[PDB]
Amino acid sequence: VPAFLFSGSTLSSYRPNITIALPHYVDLPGRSNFKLMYIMGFPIDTEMEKDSEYSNKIRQESKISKTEGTVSYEQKITVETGQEKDGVKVYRVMVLEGTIAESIEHLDKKENEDILNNNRNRIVLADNTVINFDNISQLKEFLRRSVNIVDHDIFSSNGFEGFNPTSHFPSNPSSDYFNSTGVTFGSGVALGQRSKQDLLNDGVPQYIADRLDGYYMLRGKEAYDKVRTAPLTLSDNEAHLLSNIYIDKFSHKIEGLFNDANIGLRFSDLPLRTRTALVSIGYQKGFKLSRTAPTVWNKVIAKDWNGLVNAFNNIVDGMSDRRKREGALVQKDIDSGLLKLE
Incomplete structure:
Protein backbone atom coordinates (compact mmCIF):
# COMPACT_ATOMS: atom_id res chain seq x y z
CA VAL A 1 0.00 0.00 0.00
CA PRO A 2 1.36 0.90 -2.42
CA ALA A 3 3.61 -2.05 -3.25
CA PHE A 4 6.98 -1.39 -4.93
CA LEU A 5 6.22 2.34 -4.90
CA PHE A 6 9.83 3.14 -5.88
CA SER A 7 10.31 0.32 -8.42
CA GLY A 8 10.78 0.80 -12.16
CA SER A 9 11.08 4.10 -14.04
CA THR A 10 9.00 7.17 -14.92
CA LEU A 11 8.60 9.04 -18.18
CA SER A 12 8.00 12.76 -17.64
CA SER A 13 7.66 15.95 -19.68
CA TYR A 14 8.57 18.03 -16.61
CA ARG A 15 11.13 17.81 -13.82
CA PRO A 16 11.23 19.65 -10.48
CA ASN A 17 14.72 21.21 -10.24
CA ILE A 18 23.69 18.03 -4.07
CA THR A 19 21.65 14.82 -4.17
CA ILE A 20 18.51 14.94 -1.94
CA ALA A 21 16.29 12.13 -0.58
CA LEU A 22 14.14 14.70 1.21
CA PRO A 23 10.54 15.27 0.08
CA HIS A 24 10.25 18.04 -2.50
CA TYR A 25 6.94 19.80 -3.24
CA VAL A 26 6.18 21.18 -6.70
CA ASP A 27 3.23 22.24 -8.88
CA LEU A 28 2.73 20.97 -12.40
CA PRO A 29 2.97 24.10 -14.61
CA GLY A 30 -0.34 25.36 -15.99
CA ARG A 31 -2.47 22.97 -13.95
CA SER A 32 -4.63 23.83 -10.96
CA ASN A 33 -4.86 21.22 -8.20
CA PHE A 34 -1.89 19.31 -9.60
CA LYS A 35 0.65 19.12 -6.86
CA LEU A 36 3.43 16.58 -6.71
CA MET A 37 5.63 15.27 -3.92
CA TYR A 38 8.99 13.92 -5.09
CA ILE A 39 10.66 11.34 -2.85
CA MET A 40 13.76 9.42 -3.99
CA GLY A 41 13.36 11.43 -7.18
CA PHE A 42 10.00 9.73 -7.93
CA PRO A 43 6.80 11.75 -8.50
CA ILE A 44 3.97 10.98 -6.05
CA ASP A 45 0.43 12.26 -6.49
CA THR A 46 -1.57 12.39 -3.26
CA GLU A 47 -5.21 13.42 -2.67
CA MET A 48 -6.97 14.23 0.59
CA GLU A 49 -10.47 15.41 1.38
CA LYS A 50 -9.13 17.20 4.45
CA ASP A 51 -7.43 20.52 3.83
CA SER A 52 -3.69 20.36 3.22
CA GLU A 53 -1.23 22.72 1.57
CA TYR A 54 0.88 19.67 0.69
CA SER A 55 -1.83 17.57 -1.05
CA ASN A 56 -4.41 17.83 -3.83
CA LYS A 57 -8.17 17.75 -3.24
CA ILE A 58 -10.00 14.59 -4.31
CA ARG A 59 -10.27 14.48 -8.11
CA GLN A 60 -13.53 13.90 -9.98
CA GLU A 61 -14.03 10.58 -11.76
CA SER A 62 -14.22 10.77 -15.59
CA LYS A 63 -17.33 9.64 -17.46
CA ILE A 64 -15.21 7.85 -20.10
CA SER A 65 -15.70 4.08 -20.15
CA LYS A 66 -12.70 2.07 -19.03
CA THR A 67 -13.88 -0.86 -21.19
CA GLU A 68 -15.13 0.85 -24.39
CA GLY A 69 -13.77 4.41 -24.23
CA THR A 70 -10.81 6.37 -25.57
CA VAL A 71 -8.84 9.55 -24.88
CA SER A 72 -8.04 11.96 -27.70
CA TYR A 73 -4.98 10.83 -29.67
CA GLU A 74 -3.73 14.42 -29.64
CA GLN A 75 -3.87 14.88 -25.83
CA LYS A 76 -1.19 14.26 -23.23
CA ILE A 77 -2.10 11.99 -20.31
CA THR A 78 -0.74 11.14 -16.89
CA VAL A 79 -0.54 7.45 -15.94
CA GLU A 80 -0.48 6.45 -12.28
CA THR A 81 -0.34 3.34 -10.13
CA GLY A 82 -1.28 3.23 -6.45
CA GLN A 83 -3.84 2.84 -3.67
CA GLU A 84 -6.72 4.79 -2.17
CA LYS A 85 -8.75 4.54 1.02
CA ASP A 86 -11.16 6.82 2.92
CA GLY A 87 -10.48 10.28 1.44
CA VAL A 88 -6.74 9.63 1.09
CA LYS A 89 -5.11 8.56 -2.19
CA VAL A 90 -1.48 7.83 -2.96
CA TYR A 91 -0.33 7.13 -6.48
CA ARG A 92 3.10 6.82 -7.97
CA VAL A 93 3.33 8.63 -11.31
CA MET A 94 4.48 6.32 -14.11
CA VAL A 95 3.93 8.70 -17.02
CA LEU A 96 3.70 12.45 -16.46
CA GLU A 97 2.02 14.32 -19.32
CA GLY A 98 3.19 11.92 -22.06
CA THR A 99 1.77 10.93 -25.45
CA ILE A 100 -0.45 7.88 -25.84
CA ALA A 101 2.31 6.13 -27.81
CA GLU A 102 5.11 6.96 -25.33
CA SER A 103 2.81 5.65 -22.63
CA ILE A 104 2.11 2.35 -24.41
CA GLU A 105 5.84 1.87 -24.93
CA HIS A 106 6.77 2.80 -21.36
CA LEU A 107 4.09 0.62 -19.76
CA ASP A 108 5.28 -2.38 -21.77
CA LYS A 109 8.71 -2.30 -20.02
CA LYS A 110 9.50 -5.37 -17.88
CA GLU A 111 11.03 -3.31 -15.06
CA ASN A 112 7.54 -1.79 -14.58
CA GLU A 113 5.57 -5.04 -14.37
CA ASP A 114 5.66 -5.60 -10.63
CA ILE A 115 4.44 -2.14 -9.81
CA LEU A 116 1.64 -2.23 -12.39
CA ASN A 117 0.47 -5.76 -11.61
CA ASN A 118 0.24 -5.11 -7.87
CA ASN A 119 -1.55 -1.75 -7.57
CA ARG A 120 -4.61 0.16 -8.82
CA ASN A 121 -3.95 1.78 -12.18
CA ARG A 122 -5.56 5.04 -13.33
CA ILE A 123 -5.24 7.80 -15.94
CA VAL A 124 -5.36 11.47 -14.90
CA LEU A 125 -6.57 13.40 -17.91
CA ALA A 126 -5.79 16.90 -19.13
CA ASP A 127 -9.04 18.08 -17.51
CA ASN A 128 -8.03 16.69 -14.09
CA THR A 129 -10.70 13.98 -14.10
CA VAL A 130 -9.55 10.37 -13.68
CA ILE A 131 -10.30 6.97 -15.25
CA ASN A 132 -9.88 4.05 -12.82
CA PHE A 133 -8.91 0.76 -14.46
CA ASP A 134 -9.69 -2.76 -13.22
CA ASN A 135 -6.22 -3.97 -14.16
CA ILE A 136 -3.12 -2.99 -16.17
CA SER A 137 -4.15 -5.09 -19.22
CA GLN A 138 -7.41 -3.12 -19.48
CA LEU A 139 -5.52 0.18 -19.36
CA LYS A 140 -3.11 -1.00 -22.04
CA GLU A 141 -6.06 -1.96 -24.22
CA PHE A 142 -7.63 1.47 -23.60
CA LEU A 143 -4.43 3.22 -24.78
CA ARG A 144 -4.14 0.98 -27.86
CA ARG A 145 -7.73 1.79 -28.70
CA SER A 146 -6.97 5.51 -28.22
CA VAL A 147 -4.05 5.76 -30.70
Whole structure:
Protein backbone atom coordinates (compact mmCIF):
# COMPACT_ATOMS: atom_id res chain seq x y z
CA VAL A 1 0.00 0.00 0.00
CA PRO A 2 1.36 0.90 -2.42
CA ALA A 3 3.61 -2.05 -3.25
CA PHE A 4 6.98 -1.39 -4.93
CA LEU A 5 6.22 2.34 -4.90
CA PHE A 6 9.83 3.14 -5.88
CA SER A 7 10.31 0.32 -8.42
CA GLY A 8 10.78 0.80 -12.16
CA SER A 9 11.08 4.10 -14.04
CA THR A 10 9.00 7.17 -14.92
CA LEU A 11 8.60 9.04 -18.18
CA SER A 12 8.00 12.76 -17.64
CA SER A 13 7.66 15.95 -19.68
CA TYR A 14 8.57 18.03 -16.61
CA ARG A 15 11.13 17.81 -13.82
CA PRO A 16 11.23 19.65 -10.48
CA ASN A 17 14.72 21.21 -10.24
CA ILE A 18 23.69 18.03 -4.07
CA THR A 19 21.65 14.82 -4.17
CA ILE A 20 18.51 14.94 -1.94
CA ALA A 21 16.29 12.13 -0.58
CA LEU A 22 14.14 14.70 1.21
CA PRO A 23 10.54 15.27 0.08
CA HIS A 24 10.25 18.04 -2.50
CA TYR A 25 6.94 19.80 -3.24
CA VAL A 26 6.18 21.18 -6.70
CA ASP A 27 3.23 22.24 -8.88
CA LEU A 28 2.73 20.97 -12.40
CA PRO A 29 2.97 24.10 -14.61
CA GLY A 30 -0.34 25.36 -15.99
CA ARG A 31 -2.47 22.97 -13.95
CA SER A 32 -4.63 23.83 -10.96
CA ASN A 33 -4.86 21.22 -8.20
CA PHE A 34 -1.89 19.31 -9.60
CA LYS A 35 0.65 19.12 -6.86
CA LEU A 36 3.43 16.58 -6.71
CA MET A 37 5.63 15.27 -3.92
CA TYR A 38 8.99 13.92 -5.09
CA ILE A 39 10.66 11.34 -2.85
CA MET A 40 13.76 9.42 -3.99
CA GLY A 41 13.36 11.43 -7.18
CA PHE A 42 10.00 9.73 -7.93
CA PRO A 43 6.80 11.75 -8.50
CA ILE A 44 3.97 10.98 -6.05
CA ASP A 45 0.43 12.26 -6.49
CA THR A 46 -1.57 12.39 -3.26
CA GLU A 47 -5.21 13.42 -2.67
CA MET A 48 -6.97 14.23 0.59
CA GLU A 49 -10.47 15.41 1.38
CA LYS A 50 -9.13 17.20 4.45
CA ASP A 51 -7.43 20.52 3.83
CA SER A 52 -3.69 20.36 3.22
CA GLU A 53 -1.23 22.72 1.57
CA TYR A 54 0.88 19.67 0.69
CA SER A 55 -1.83 17.57 -1.05
CA ASN A 56 -4.41 17.83 -3.83
CA LYS A 57 -8.17 17.75 -3.24
CA ILE A 58 -10.00 14.59 -4.31
CA ARG A 59 -10.27 14.48 -8.11
CA GLN A 60 -13.53 13.90 -9.98
CA GLU A 61 -14.03 10.58 -11.76
CA SER A 62 -14.22 10.77 -15.59
CA LYS A 63 -17.33 9.64 -17.46
CA ILE A 64 -15.21 7.85 -20.10
CA SER A 65 -15.70 4.08 -20.15
CA LYS A 66 -12.70 2.07 -19.03
CA THR A 67 -13.88 -0.86 -21.19
CA GLU A 68 -15.13 0.85 -24.39
CA GLY A 69 -13.77 4.41 -24.23
CA THR A 70 -10.81 6.37 -25.57
CA VAL A 71 -8.84 9.55 -24.88
CA SER A 72 -8.04 11.96 -27.70
CA TYR A 73 -4.98 10.83 -29.67
CA GLU A 74 -3.73 14.42 -29.64
CA GLN A 75 -3.87 14.88 -25.83
CA LYS A 76 -1.19 14.26 -23.23
CA ILE A 77 -2.10 11.99 -20.31
CA THR A 78 -0.74 11.14 -16.89
CA VAL A 79 -0.54 7.45 -15.94
CA GLU A 80 -0.48 6.45 -12.28
CA THR A 81 -0.34 3.34 -10.13
CA GLY A 82 -1.28 3.23 -6.45
CA GLN A 83 -3.84 2.84 -3.67
CA GLU A 84 -6.72 4.79 -2.17
CA LYS A 85 -8.75 4.54 1.02
CA ASP A 86 -11.16 6.82 2.92
CA GLY A 87 -10.48 10.28 1.44
CA VAL A 88 -6.74 9.63 1.09
CA LYS A 89 -5.11 8.56 -2.19
CA VAL A 90 -1.48 7.83 -2.96
CA TYR A 91 -0.33 7.13 -6.48
CA ARG A 92 3.10 6.82 -7.97
CA VAL A 93 3.33 8.63 -11.31
CA MET A 94 4.48 6.32 -14.11
CA VAL A 95 3.93 8.70 -17.02
CA LEU A 96 3.70 12.45 -16.46
CA GLU A 97 2.02 14.32 -19.32
CA GLY A 98 3.19 11.92 -22.06
CA THR A 99 1.77 10.93 -25.45
CA ILE A 100 -0.45 7.88 -25.84
CA ALA A 101 2.31 6.13 -27.81
CA GLU A 102 5.11 6.96 -25.33
CA SER A 103 2.81 5.65 -22.63
CA ILE A 104 2.11 2.35 -24.41
CA GLU A 105 5.84 1.87 -24.93
CA HIS A 106 6.77 2.80 -21.36
CA LEU A 107 4.09 0.62 -19.76
CA ASP A 108 5.28 -2.38 -21.77
CA LYS A 109 8.71 -2.30 -20.02
CA LYS A 110 9.50 -5.37 -17.88
CA GLU A 111 11.03 -3.31 -15.06
CA ASN A 112 7.54 -1.79 -14.58
CA GLU A 113 5.57 -5.04 -14.37
CA ASP A 114 5.66 -5.60 -10.63
CA ILE A 115 4.44 -2.14 -9.81
CA LEU A 116 1.64 -2.23 -12.39
CA ASN A 117 0.47 -5.76 -11.61
CA ASN A 118 0.24 -5.11 -7.87
CA ASN A 119 -1.55 -1.75 -7.57
CA ARG A 120 -4.61 0.16 -8.82
CA ASN A 121 -3.95 1.78 -12.18
CA ARG A 122 -5.56 5.04 -13.33
CA ILE A 123 -5.24 7.80 -15.94
CA VAL A 124 -5.36 11.47 -14.90
CA LEU A 125 -6.57 13.40 -17.91
CA ALA A 126 -5.79 16.90 -19.13
CA ASP A 127 -9.04 18.08 -17.51
CA ASN A 128 -8.03 16.69 -14.09
CA THR A 129 -10.70 13.98 -14.10
CA VAL A 130 -9.55 10.37 -13.68
CA ILE A 131 -10.30 6.97 -15.25
CA ASN A 132 -9.88 4.05 -12.82
CA PHE A 133 -8.91 0.76 -14.46
CA ASP A 134 -9.69 -2.76 -13.22
CA ASN A 135 -6.22 -3.97 -14.16
CA ILE A 136 -3.12 -2.99 -16.17
CA SER A 137 -4.15 -5.09 -19.22
CA GLN A 138 -7.41 -3.12 -19.48
CA LEU A 139 -5.52 0.18 -19.36
CA LYS A 140 -3.11 -1.00 -22.04
CA GLU A 141 -6.06 -1.96 -24.22
CA PHE A 142 -7.63 1.47 -23.60
CA LEU A 143 -4.43 3.22 -24.78
CA ARG A 144 -4.14 0.98 -27.86
CA ARG A 145 -7.73 1.79 -28.70
CA SER A 146 -6.97 5.51 -28.22
CA VAL A 147 -4.05 5.76 -30.70
CA ASN A 148 -6.38 4.88 -33.58
CA ILE A 149 -8.08 7.55 -35.63
CA VAL A 150 -10.95 5.19 -36.53
CA ASP A 151 -12.05 1.79 -35.28
CA HIS A 152 -10.65 -0.55 -37.92
CA ASP A 153 -12.62 -3.61 -36.79
CA ILE A 154 -15.92 -1.75 -37.21
CA PHE A 155 -14.90 -0.13 -40.49
CA SER A 156 -13.91 -3.46 -42.11
CA SER A 157 -16.94 -5.29 -40.69
CA ASN A 158 -19.71 -6.69 -42.86
CA GLY A 159 -22.17 -3.95 -42.01
CA PHE A 160 -19.89 -1.21 -43.22
CA GLU A 161 -17.04 -1.47 -45.76
CA GLY A 162 -16.59 -5.24 -45.62
CA PHE A 163 -13.30 -7.08 -46.00
CA ASN A 164 -12.08 -9.30 -48.87
CA PRO A 165 -8.49 -10.61 -48.54
CA THR A 166 -8.62 -11.93 -52.12
CA SER A 167 -7.85 -9.66 -55.07
CA HIS A 168 -11.21 -8.55 -56.41
CA PHE A 169 -12.75 -6.33 -59.08
CA PRO A 170 -15.63 -4.24 -57.69
CA SER A 171 -16.90 -3.16 -61.14
CA ASN A 172 -17.85 -4.26 -64.69
CA PRO A 173 -19.31 -2.82 -67.94
CA SER A 174 -22.67 -1.01 -67.81
CA SER A 175 -20.18 0.90 -65.75
CA ASP A 176 -20.09 2.32 -63.20
CA TYR A 177 -16.48 3.06 -64.21
CA PHE A 178 -15.23 -0.22 -65.73
CA ASN A 179 -11.93 1.06 -67.15
CA SER A 180 -11.46 3.25 -64.08
CA THR A 181 -11.65 0.26 -61.71
CA GLY A 182 -8.59 -1.71 -60.66
CA VAL A 183 -7.41 -4.62 -58.57
CA THR A 184 -8.64 -4.22 -54.97
CA PHE A 185 -7.62 -5.87 -51.67
CA GLY A 186 -8.89 -6.01 -48.11
CA SER A 187 -11.29 -3.17 -47.45
CA GLY A 188 -11.20 -1.14 -50.64
CA VAL A 189 -7.45 -0.69 -51.17
CA ALA A 190 -7.22 -0.19 -54.92
CA LEU A 191 -4.09 -0.54 -57.07
CA GLY A 192 -5.28 1.00 -60.33
CA GLN A 193 -3.48 4.29 -59.65
CA ARG A 194 -0.64 2.95 -57.46
CA SER A 195 2.95 1.75 -58.02
CA LYS A 196 4.86 -0.51 -55.62
CA GLN A 197 6.95 2.56 -54.74
CA ASP A 198 3.75 4.38 -53.71
CA LEU A 199 2.89 1.57 -51.25
CA LEU A 200 6.45 1.66 -49.89
CA ASN A 201 6.23 5.44 -49.38
CA ASP A 202 2.98 4.93 -47.42
CA GLY A 203 4.81 2.46 -45.20
CA VAL A 204 3.59 -0.86 -46.59
CA PRO A 205 6.23 -3.49 -45.72
CA GLN A 206 8.43 -4.70 -48.57
CA TYR A 207 7.21 -8.31 -48.23
CA ILE A 208 3.59 -7.24 -48.79
CA ALA A 209 4.39 -4.78 -51.53
CA ASP A 210 6.47 -7.42 -53.40
CA ARG A 211 3.56 -9.83 -53.14
CA LEU A 212 1.47 -7.34 -55.14
CA ASP A 213 3.72 -7.25 -58.23
CA GLY A 214 1.73 -7.56 -61.45
CA TYR A 215 -1.48 -6.06 -60.01
CA TYR A 216 -0.24 -2.45 -59.96
CA MET A 217 -1.72 0.04 -62.43
CA LEU A 218 -4.02 -2.55 -64.01
CA ARG A 219 -7.43 -1.13 -64.90
CA GLY A 220 -10.71 -2.14 -66.55
CA LYS A 221 -10.70 -5.32 -68.55
CA GLU A 222 -7.04 -6.04 -67.89
CA ALA A 223 -7.82 -5.83 -64.16
CA TYR A 224 -10.97 -7.95 -64.31
CA ASP A 225 -9.14 -10.47 -66.45
CA LYS A 226 -6.23 -10.54 -63.96
CA VAL A 227 -8.48 -11.01 -60.92
CA ARG A 228 -10.37 -13.84 -62.65
CA THR A 229 -7.29 -15.41 -64.26
CA ALA A 230 -4.72 -15.12 -61.47
CA PRO A 231 -6.24 -14.13 -58.11
CA LEU A 232 -4.09 -13.62 -55.01
CA THR A 233 -5.29 -14.22 -51.48
CA LEU A 234 -3.49 -12.42 -48.67
CA SER A 235 -3.59 -13.74 -45.14
CA ASP A 236 -5.98 -11.88 -42.91
CA ASN A 237 -2.96 -10.40 -41.09
CA GLU A 238 -1.36 -8.91 -44.20
CA ALA A 239 -4.65 -7.74 -45.73
CA HIS A 240 -5.62 -5.98 -42.46
CA LEU A 241 -2.19 -4.33 -42.22
CA LEU A 242 -2.45 -3.08 -45.84
CA SER A 243 -6.09 -1.95 -45.32
CA ASN A 244 -5.46 -0.15 -42.04
CA ILE A 245 -2.55 1.74 -43.57
CA TYR A 246 -4.89 3.09 -46.27
CA ILE A 247 -7.87 3.60 -43.97
CA ASP A 248 -5.63 5.77 -41.74
CA LYS A 249 -4.35 7.76 -44.72
CA PHE A 250 -7.95 8.42 -45.86
CA SER A 251 -9.12 9.32 -42.31
CA HIS A 252 -6.49 12.08 -42.27
CA LYS A 253 -8.20 13.72 -45.28
CA ILE A 254 -11.45 13.75 -43.35
CA GLU A 255 -9.66 15.05 -40.23
CA GLY A 256 -8.16 17.88 -42.32
CA LEU A 257 -11.54 18.97 -43.70
CA PHE A 258 -13.08 19.02 -40.20
CA ASN A 259 -10.16 20.86 -38.57
CA ASP A 260 -10.06 23.41 -41.42
CA ALA A 261 -13.71 24.25 -40.62
CA ASN A 262 -12.35 25.70 -37.33
CA ILE A 263 -15.53 25.09 -35.32
CA GLY A 264 -13.92 25.02 -31.86
CA LEU A 265 -13.18 21.29 -31.79
CA ARG A 266 -10.54 19.19 -33.49
CA PHE A 267 -11.37 15.84 -35.10
CA SER A 268 -9.51 14.13 -32.25
CA ASP A 269 -12.02 15.62 -29.78
CA LEU A 270 -14.80 13.53 -31.35
CA PRO A 271 -15.10 10.07 -29.81
CA LEU A 272 -13.83 7.00 -31.71
CA ARG A 273 -17.18 5.65 -32.96
CA THR A 274 -18.30 9.02 -34.30
CA ARG A 275 -14.97 9.53 -36.12
CA THR A 276 -15.47 6.04 -37.56
CA ALA A 277 -18.98 6.83 -38.80
CA LEU A 278 -17.81 9.97 -40.57
CA VAL A 279 -14.88 8.22 -42.18
CA SER A 280 -17.14 5.32 -43.25
CA ILE A 281 -19.60 7.54 -45.09
CA GLY A 282 -16.74 9.53 -46.68
CA TYR A 283 -14.99 6.39 -47.91
CA GLN A 284 -18.14 5.17 -49.64
CA LYS A 285 -19.52 8.51 -50.95
CA GLY A 286 -16.28 10.47 -51.49
CA PHE A 287 -14.27 12.40 -49.01
CA LYS A 288 -15.66 15.89 -49.36
CA LEU A 289 -18.67 15.42 -47.19
CA SER A 290 -19.85 18.99 -47.68
CA ARG A 291 -20.61 18.00 -51.29
CA THR A 292 -21.21 14.24 -50.90
CA ALA A 293 -23.34 14.08 -47.75
CA PRO A 294 -24.40 17.66 -47.04
CA THR A 295 -27.04 16.88 -44.39
CA VAL A 296 -24.44 14.99 -42.35
CA TRP A 297 -21.65 17.54 -42.76
CA ASN A 298 -23.95 20.47 -41.89
CA LYS A 299 -24.98 18.70 -38.67
CA VAL A 300 -21.27 18.11 -37.90
CA ILE A 301 -20.26 21.73 -38.45
CA ALA A 302 -23.25 22.82 -36.30
CA LYS A 303 -22.21 20.43 -33.52
CA ASP A 304 -25.79 19.18 -33.38
CA TRP A 305 -25.24 15.57 -32.39
CA ASN A 306 -28.81 14.25 -32.09
CA GLY A 307 -29.42 15.94 -35.44
CA LEU A 308 -26.43 14.14 -36.90
CA VAL A 309 -27.97 10.83 -35.85
CA ASN A 310 -31.17 11.84 -37.58
CA ALA A 311 -29.32 12.95 -40.75
CA PHE A 312 -27.63 9.53 -41.08
CA ASN A 313 -31.02 7.89 -40.56
CA ASN A 314 -32.64 10.04 -43.24
CA ILE A 315 -30.19 9.40 -46.07
CA VAL A 316 -31.86 7.55 -48.95
CA ASP A 317 -29.05 6.27 -51.15
CA GLY A 318 -29.86 2.60 -51.85
CA MET A 319 -27.19 2.00 -49.17
CA SER A 320 -29.47 3.06 -46.33
CA ASP A 321 -28.92 0.28 -43.81
CA ARG A 322 -25.21 1.15 -43.66
CA ARG A 323 -26.14 4.84 -43.24
CA LYS A 324 -28.24 3.75 -40.26
CA ARG A 325 -25.41 1.72 -38.69
CA GLU A 326 -23.25 4.87 -38.96
CA GLY A 327 -25.93 6.89 -37.21
CA ALA A 328 -26.23 4.23 -34.52
CA LEU A 329 -22.48 4.60 -33.82
CA VAL A 330 -23.09 8.30 -33.22
CA GLN A 331 -26.11 7.49 -30.99
CA LYS A 332 -23.99 5.13 -28.88
CA ASP A 333 -21.51 7.94 -28.24
CA ILE A 334 -24.34 10.31 -27.26
CA ASP A 335 -25.71 7.70 -24.84
CA SER A 336 -22.18 7.34 -23.38
CA GLY A 337 -22.06 11.05 -22.54
CA LEU A 338 -19.18 11.54 -25.02
CA LEU A 339 -21.03 14.03 -27.16
CA LYS A 340 -22.26 16.81 -24.98
CA LEU A 341 -25.54 18.28 -26.17
CA GLU A 342 -26.79 21.85 -25.97
